[PDB]
């Protein structure tokens, strides 16, 4: 599923605080 997304880290949980991430 995730490895088809070109605009996201294919690893689960790439940021501890996702709301801090403006690019996700």
């Amino acid at each position: 599923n995730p490895n088809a997304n070109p605009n996201a880290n294919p690893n689960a949980n790439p940021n501890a605080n996702p709301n801090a991430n403006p690019n996700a």
Partner: antibody
Amino acid sequence: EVQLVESGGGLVQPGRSLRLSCTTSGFTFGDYAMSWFRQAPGKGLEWVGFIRSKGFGGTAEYAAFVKGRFTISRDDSRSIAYLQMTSLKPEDTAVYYCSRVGVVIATAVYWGQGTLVTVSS
Amino acid sequence: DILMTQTPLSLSVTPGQPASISCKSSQSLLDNDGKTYLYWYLQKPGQSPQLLIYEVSNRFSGVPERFSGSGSGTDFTLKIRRVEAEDVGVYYCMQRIDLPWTFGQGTKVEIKR
């Protein structure tokens, strides 16, 4: 204006290697995933691979027919994406396209003119 | 792989008349995030592909209003309201919910004079 220019294509003997470049201008190259496509003479469009922005790990994905042999790379300082091909087969003969993948529109949006690669003895 | 089959493969359209192109995928294109990863491309003769529609129904900027998309799940339709000479070429749908990204085989559109 967004510009993408493919180069490096030409006549290559089977089993040999060839590197294609996607030289870009008009945008911050590092922020975008770059994707490669190909089209055999008279055939449809075929996805080859893409490489993510280093903002998302900078890793690449590849089509089935293409793996082991091809490596997609990116030079963020020069704004150039690469398609490194190895052990080419006649079936790899195609126009190869590079494309800027959007963020709102997360697919191949802007395409270069393509570069013809001919694999033949 | 996800199979994408377009019907018909060829279309002869009287100028000013509509055209409809179907695309069927072997799996659903609706992802868990609520987006549907179906896109429509046009390749004019001797030209690079250009995007027409993203996510089933959305027009890329500068695409004429006579182009519209619709559908859901596994069945999608591209509609050209009033075909012109500029619309001649091969239309592809493309999915990217799954690797590899795959295209349909392409639907050729010509003017019927």
